[PDB]
């Protein structure tokens, strides 16, 4: 019996639970009668006694070895609750105060390791990534609930200033791709701003998206993020925050509408000199209606909550009363500047008049979704009737009428459930499809 729980032909086995041996030794060199563990201690003529050593001694040897990663992994393995040799390793038996007294020299030596590498021009992308990932994960499992032990965020800020005079070229890169793979969120605002500035004088424009896409909304930092986005005019990122954090979708739509109808003075979300392209409203609605988060592909986080959002957007888009300012209000905005003409579906009319081709493409994409399926409520018949009545009344220069007729013909081409149309109604479409002087669409008209 080596100890109270450890028990020892050419291996100390713990009696508790399994009887697996500890390790192996070669006593033949020491001239091993065979039978000839006293007080936790032990060739041909001389007397040799073997004794255990300290973990700190092993760490010191690893320092002399020139590599700290071995000692890093050794300490991490020792940090596990299963330490049958804790008493033999001059450590406290219970794991709680064992981890309490440890993991401080872990932090100090991890800090010293980066300085050791940067001293001998260790600019290789390999070693730094491995060491940083190991440190990050190890600090991640150990939930720091006690005194001292600065969080992982503080460690990154400390390590940032170590690289200086062009040495910050790849350290930001090594900090990145951990957000991409995903093992930590809630980074320090200062380092966030530094990384944003570093990639600002560069044309990445894509690593930033993921940098915000994965990172949890628990760390808000909205004001700083909003200011950075406004300075960099990053409208796709701007809309996402309002979609998720501010929990408002009508406000971006109203801002885009104001940007459209010569009313940029009333915009709130977008106020910088740069103006987003008008096509955003022709893709954001597509994403929301079918179910999607702009600009990514994931439909929705909450299942049932999406129904309210889609019903709200569908009611607002195809309204016919020119609803008032979002939320409770006493006055109503207008599509046009002077409010005298009767607004019979003004928003839909404006959207159709702004761009025929993109609007038709968006509608064609929307019909293939399950939103119009019955499963107020808007069906395909309502939209087809709206377009059919919008066909006449000479309100178009015949540049949009032909496209509308083509789209109606294509929509009524397929009908197991779509729509039944009166015979006289088809006469207008048939006449319009081949009575216009517009050119460049001869090939499309034939197949349609």
């Amino acid at each position: 019996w080596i100890d109270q729980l450890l028990l020892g032909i050419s291996l100390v086995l713990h009696p508790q639970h399994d009887f697996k041996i500890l390790l192996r030794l070669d006593f033949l060199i020491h001239d091993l009668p065979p039978n000839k563990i006293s007080r936790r201690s032990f060739t041909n003529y001389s007397f040799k006694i073997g004794k255990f050593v300290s973990w700190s001694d092993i760490t010191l040897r690893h320092i002399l070895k020139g590599d700290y990663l071995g000692a890093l992994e050794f300490i991490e393995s020792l940090l596990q609750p299963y330490c049958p040799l804790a008493n033999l390793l001059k450590l406290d038996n219970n794991t709680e105060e064992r981890t309490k007294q440890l993991m401080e020299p872990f932090y100090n030596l991890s800090l010293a390791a980066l300085r050791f590498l940067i001293k001998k021009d260790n600019a290789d992308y390999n070693r730094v990534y491995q060491l940083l990932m190991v440190v990050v994960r190890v600090l991640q499992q150990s939930s720091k609930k006690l005194d001292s032990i600065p969080s992982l965020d503080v460690f990154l800020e400390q390590g940032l200033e170590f690289f200086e005079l062009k040495d910050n070229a790849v350290y930001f890169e090594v900090v990145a791709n951990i957000v991409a793979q995903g093992s930590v969120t809630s980074i320090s605002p200062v380092l966030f701003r530094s990384i944003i500035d570093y990639y600002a004088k560069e044309e990445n424009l894509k690593v930033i998206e993921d940098l915000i896409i994965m990172l949890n909304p628990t760390t808000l930092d909205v004001d700083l993020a909003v200011k950075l986005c406004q300075k960099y005019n990053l409208f796709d990122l701007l809309i996402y925050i309002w979609n998720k954090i501010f929990d408002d979708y009508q406000t971006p739509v109203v801002d885009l509408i104001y940007r459209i109808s010569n009313q940029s003075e009333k915009c709130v979300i977008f106020n910088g000199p740069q103006v987003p392209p008008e096509t955003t409203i022709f893709d954001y609605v597509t994403y929301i209606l079918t179910g999607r988060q702009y600009p990514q592909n994931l439909s929705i986080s909450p299942s049932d909550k999406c129904s309210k959002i889609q019903r709200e957007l569908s009611a607002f888009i195809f309204s016919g009363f020119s609803i008032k300012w979002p939320s409770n209000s006493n006055h109503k905005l207008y599509i046009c500047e002077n409010p005298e003409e009767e607004p019979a579906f003004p928003y839909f009319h404006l959207l159709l008049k702004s761009n025929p081709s993109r609007f038709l493409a968006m509608l064609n994409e929307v019909f293939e979704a399950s939103l119009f399926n019955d499963d107020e409520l808007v069906s395909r018949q309502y939209v087809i009737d709206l377009l059919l009545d919008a066909m006449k009344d000479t309100g178009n220069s015949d540049n949009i009428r032909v496209l509308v007729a083509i789209f109606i013909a294509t929509s009524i081409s397929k009908y197991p459930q779509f729509i039944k149309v009166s015979n006289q109604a088809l006469d207008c479409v048939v006449n319009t499809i081949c009575s216009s002087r517009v050119q460049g669409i001869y090939e499309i008209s034939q197949i349609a």
């Binding site: 007080r39 040799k48 073997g50």
Partner: protein, 47 residues
């Protein structure tokens, strides 16, 4: 691994001046075919 071995060569000198042995709290005893048990302290101190 962490088993550092410390060796004292004074055993041969003491024998000149190895069947079984047993260590005490501070010293050790050795017995062989000589028939005289040898007591040796850890500080090179000697029936």
């Amino acid at each position: 691994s962490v088993v550092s071995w410390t060796t004292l060569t004074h055993v041969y000198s003491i024998l000149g001046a190895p069947t079984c042995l047993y260590p005490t709290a501070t010293y050790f005893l050795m017995g062989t075919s000589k028939g005289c048990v040898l007591i040796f302290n850890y500080n090179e101190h000697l029936i």
